[PDB]
Structure 1
């Protein structure tokens, strides 16, 4: 049978369409979950969904696995997680011209672009920022660059990818703050799907061991910049 995966195909380098949106789904998490399914002897069925609906989609059983999910204690309480397969660091990104934002606590009463439905949007709302909801990271940085927002909280992976895809933009950005720790990212499943979870975990250990992980990782990321997760053991 198929492996049903929910994702949003406008999040380079995680999940995005080739040939400038016209081609097949690709990206780091897409390749990785397809490799897990190949080794599981499974076809992958991708259900493209907006981020605001990814977790509700999982709840609704429209699909079985979500990619690139940050582990939180409330998500672990409510869902099953694979072993982490990557980590990101959350950054406070501002224009290089900004003067009054030097920390996360400074975002109170500032205008902040965050993706509707995300924990980062909730955090911005807890900070009593004024939210401008974006539909992906690209728009978040577009809103900042156009001066419609003062800042955005974004993980390092999509931000650095943005700088790679357009280095003229950027150099126009600066990182005002960053979380003290990086953040484990894993595949998220319905609670109780213990057998799929174990299978994914064993396949990911294999992928680490025979070098397939590093191959997928290096395809998309700068090792000197993006944090990976511990290897496995024979």
Structure 2
């Protein structure tokens, strides 16, 4: 009962997982994973670009059938939607100017301007722990605006997925004079357990098909072959 075309939403401003190349075509590990799973599921797949915070609403409105967009598997989201098995791990961490004393603490961030992606686990954490207590937490439509507001000095720091920041910004020319500010933020309730394909709860058959494809491409070594294009480490985690 799988649709002839699985529509997959993604927010294409989160390299190296999802972004656009020079032609405007979808590139990144999420795209590679989704395309490889779709190949093995024997379905066609059409990618649909969207602001990150629109993904879960579009899914619930059936405007898309799946979300592959570094979507963290959280307790809160599982009350709304279902997930495939984990695609890869995702920790959260702050970035700031090289030499910044900033730590992911209320004390260190008071009077600071901190960027977070609207609709993200990072916004949830920052709004609850930081924004209410005086920290200027600013929500953004997409992560590229955040990077730009950081390098323009409009933001003192930004919270996002650690691997995204590292490969998508810090190790790029634009992020040369920036670094991680403090260690990963550990809060399993807000940040969840890796990312997965977001799905409607009643699409059990579609979930089983994604799950089957994922295990097979991991088993035969395709996952690691695809991952090496982007990462010299175990992006999957535990």
2:183 — aligned with what?
177
2:80 — aligned with what?
78
Does the 8 Å CA contact 1:137/1:158 hold for their aligned counterparts?
no
Query: Which is worse superposed, 135-144 or 68-77?
Result: 135-144
- Please, what is the CA RMSD of the aligned residues? 1.9
Does the 8 Å CA contact 1:104/1:177 hold for their aligned counterparts?
no
Alignment length (residue pairs)? 224
Consecutive unaligned residues of structure 1, counting only runs of 5 or more, are none
Could you tell me how far apart the structure 2 residues matched to 1:76 and 1:105 are? Answer: 28
- 1:191 aligns to what SS in structure 2? coil
Deviation at 1:74, TM superposition (A): 1.2
Q: How does 1:95-134 map to 2 (within 5 A)?
A: 95-99=97-101, 101-106=102-107, 107-126=109-128, 127-128=130-131, 129-134=135-140
- 1:47 aligns to what SS in structure 2? strand
- 1:176 aligns to what SS in structure 2? coil
Match of 2:89 among 80, 87, 92: 87
Could you tell me how far apart the structure 2 residues matched to 1:110 and 1:196 are? Answer: 44
1:214 — aligned with what?
224
Does the 8 Å CA contact 1:4/1:44 hold for their aligned counterparts?
yes
Q: Which has the higher strand share?
A: 1
2:66 — aligned with what?
65
Deviation at 1:97, TM superposition (A): 4.1
- 2:194 aligns to what SS in structure 1? strand
Does the 8 Å CA contact 2:115/2:157 hold for their aligned counterparts?
yes
Q: Could you tell me the TM-score, scaled by structure 2's length?
A: 0.86
Does the 8 Å CA contact 1:113/1:132 hold for their aligned counterparts?
yes
| Superposed CA offset, 1:41-97 (max 9, x none) | 111111111112111111111011101210110112221111101001110222224
Q: Could you tell me the TM-score, scaled by structure 1's length?
A: 0.87
